[PDB]
């Protein structure tokens, strides 16, 4: 009857961060050591996070300690798992479990467990922004560039290396319903001094330490 | 079920000038009131509570004032870092209400846009997308409508759009519009269409290209 459920999985990338829960039923969590547990895709349990009685002690596996974070909400029977600077090994189905008995002793097995939540770690820390041309066509027109499917925050934009600055608009990132952002930088220049002065925009990406220029120029 | 109204929503003035924004509660909130400034990106910083107590560190142009349900934030002599949002706030013990935000910002004149439409580049289309931007040039005021009509047909859900902050010497705004398409959607039609709605347009302005 005692029943138990895992909250928050998903993809995350190399370094980041994801934050699980435990919510039970049918038992109060307060006296009870609360214990996290993994299974690796080669098969095998790997003992996560343990949380004694009122979290009075605070137990990691040595891969997991200093970078995961066991919590414990006792009034509304909740139980948390932080993961930070993740891993890609860290890659796993994560079960919550509890150390249990008819009669609860000083060393009882997990004689209940969560369905499970899926973690998965993506290998690719940064992504590489593609970077295309916004090329042109009343004596002044526009042009600019397109910064593409990368990640992640945050890029810089110049353009001619930092010599045309006025008529200049880089416009904020948008989150792109892949997970990568997308920004479009501009500038306005005469109609006139298009074929003759030659323009580039300047993509600097300090996370992948990404330096694009790109010439935006008609047909 | 503490209502709590701010006005104006947006609030145009110049530097030096001596400014107010009003905040309202639906009912008796005393003096349990704090204002907060929040500039784009960073996280709101608290500047007076208990309707008129300024924080340490706070300028004196800054004022507060009111009781019950009237408040009143008042900014003399605006300085250009002044330029922000404004939140008002009501803050009981276990929870609290925020107002809608004020935008204050540089009064100028109504600028109508420039409409410049893009369409996506040979390089990209290989790649297997389409990317058709709209671009909406040195604006005034912010508030500014973008429509795409791919073969007149009206689209939604496919369009993201970003705005910049009021620029240091002009005091407009620029809005750039992305239309995002598979390379096989993109190549089932033929006219792309942008169709922008603005104050200082005497109509929408809608710029246009074909497939080649
Ligand atoms: C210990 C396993 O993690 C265990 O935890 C849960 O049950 C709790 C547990 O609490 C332990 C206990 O103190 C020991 C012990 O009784 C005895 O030898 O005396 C000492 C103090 O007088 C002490 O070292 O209680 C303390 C504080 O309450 C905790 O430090 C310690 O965690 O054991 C008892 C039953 O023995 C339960 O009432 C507790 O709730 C369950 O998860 C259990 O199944 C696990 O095996």
């Known amino acids: 009857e005692v029943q138990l459920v895992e909250s928050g999985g998903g993809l995350v990338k190399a370094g980041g961060s994801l934050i699980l829960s435990c919510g039970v039923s049918?038992?109060?969590?307060?006296?009870?050591?609360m214990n996290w547990v993994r299974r690796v895709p080669g098969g095998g349990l790997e003992w996560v996070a343990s949380?004694?009685?009122?979290?009075?002690?605070?137990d990691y596996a040595d891969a997991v300690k200093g970078r995961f974070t066991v919590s414990r909400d006792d009034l509304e029977d909740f139980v948390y798992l932080q993961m930070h600077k993740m891993r890609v090994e860290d890659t796993a189905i994560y079960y919550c479990?509890?150390?249990?008995?008819?009669?609860?002793?000083?060393?009882?097995?997990?004689?209940?467990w969560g369905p499970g939540t899926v973690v998965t770690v993506s290998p690719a820390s940064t992504k590489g922004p593609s970077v295309f041309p916004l090329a042109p066509s009343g004596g002044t027109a526009a042009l600019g560039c397109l910064v593409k499917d990368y990640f992640p925050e945050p890029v810089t934009v110049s353009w001619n290396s930092g010599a045309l600055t006025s008529g200049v608009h880089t416009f904020p990132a948008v989150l792109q319903s892949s997970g990568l952002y997308s920004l479009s930088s501009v500038v306005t220049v005469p109609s006139s001094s298009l074929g003759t002065q030659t323009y580039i925009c300047n993509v600097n990406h300090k996370p992948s330490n990404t330096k694009v220029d790109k010439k935006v120029e008609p047909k | 079920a503490v209502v709590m109204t701010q006005s104006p929503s947006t609030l145009s003035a110049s530097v030096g000038d001596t400014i107010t924004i009003t905040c309202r509660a639906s009912q008796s909130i005393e003096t349990w009131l704090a204002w907060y400034q929040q500039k784009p990106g960073k996280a709101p910083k608290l500047l007076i509570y208990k309707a008129s107590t300024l924080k340490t560190g706070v300028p004196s142009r800054f004022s507060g004032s009111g009781s019950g349900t009237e408040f009143t934030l008042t900014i003399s002599g605006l300085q250009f870092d002044d330029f922000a949002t404004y939140h008002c706030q009501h803050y009981a013990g276990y929870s609290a209400t925020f107002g809608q935000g004020t935008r204050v910002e540089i009064k100028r004149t109504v600028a109508a846009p420039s409409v410049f439409i893009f369409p996506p580049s040979d390089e990209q289309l290989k790649s297997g997308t389409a990317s058709v931007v709209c671009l909406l040039n040195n604006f005034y005021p912010r508030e500014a409508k973008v429509q795409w009509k791919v073969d007149n047909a009206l689209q939604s859900g496919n369009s993201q759009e970003s705005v910049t902050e009021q620029d240091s010497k002009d005091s407009t705004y620029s809005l750039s519009s992305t239309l995002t398409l598979s390379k096989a959607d993109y190549e089932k039609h033929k006219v792309y269409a942008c169709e922008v709605t603005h104050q200082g347009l005497s109509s929408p302005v809608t710029k246009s290209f074909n497939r080649g």
């Open positions: 479990a509890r150390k249990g008995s008819d009669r609860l002793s000083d060393n009882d097995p997990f004689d209940a």
């Open positions: 049918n038992f109060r969590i307060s006296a009870h050591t």
């Open positions: 949380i004694s009685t009122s979290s009075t002690y605070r």
